[PDB]
Write a protein that binds this ligand. Structure first.
Ligand SMILES: N[C@H]1CCN(S(=O)(=O)c2ccccc2)C1
Ligand SMILES: N[C@H]1CCN(S(=O)(=O)c2ccccc2)C1
Ligand SMILES: N[C@H]1CCN(S(=O)(=O)c2ccccc2)C1
Ligand SMILES: [Zn+2]
Ligand SMILES: [Zn+2]
Ligand SMILES: [Zn+2]
Ligand SMILES: [Zn+2]
Lengths: 75, 69
């Protein structure tokens, strides 16, 4: 039904929000510290000197284990 | 249709996976450091001296800003 199409769109958008903002392919699993923006995969977060969202200096990256993780790289 | 019920269940499970594993009421937004387990809201994370997933000592809690929030 049309309701099935609406639910498919909601699911698709939530899943896309869990993907890296730089490569759009891998799941987000890294946090820029101390600002806390958690928007990148490990590879894309590796060489950024400043946060791509707030411009704060990246003192270090913290790996995060989230219950939503489903990609082979995070299992 | 039956597919509408299947999609509602998938959406419910994904939304429940974003909620605190301790209180089940607030969104996950905190990481236990240095282990990295990100399973609690800030109120439950503040009250735990040991990670509830791996039992490692919590050296500090890092707030996380996630695009799914
Ligand atoms: N990749 C996995 C490894 C652990 N994380 S988790 O989010 O800490 C977690 C812990 C226990 C139950 C459900 C989720 C997910
Ligand atoms: N050697 C450091 C590297 C980061 N970790 S930490 O647990 O994130 C941490 C950071 C700041 C204060 C207290 C704990 C310990
Ligand atoms: N539209 C994206 C751009 C980056 N943000 S964010 O860093 O995930 C964030 C999450 C919660 C509050 C404020 C910011 C979402
Ligand atoms: Zn990436
Ligand atoms: Zn930032
Ligand atoms: Zn909680
Ligand atoms: Zn842990």
């Amino acid at each position: 039904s049309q309701q099935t199409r609406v639910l498919q769109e909601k699911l698709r958008k939530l899943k896309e929000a869990m993907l890296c903002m730089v490569c759009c392919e891998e799941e987000i699993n890294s946090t820029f510290c101390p600002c806390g923006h958690t928007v990148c995969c490990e590879s894309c977060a590796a060489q950024l000197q400043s946060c791509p969202v707030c411009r704060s200096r990246v003192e270090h990256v913290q790996h995060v284990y989230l219950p939503t993780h489903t990609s082979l790289l995070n299992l």
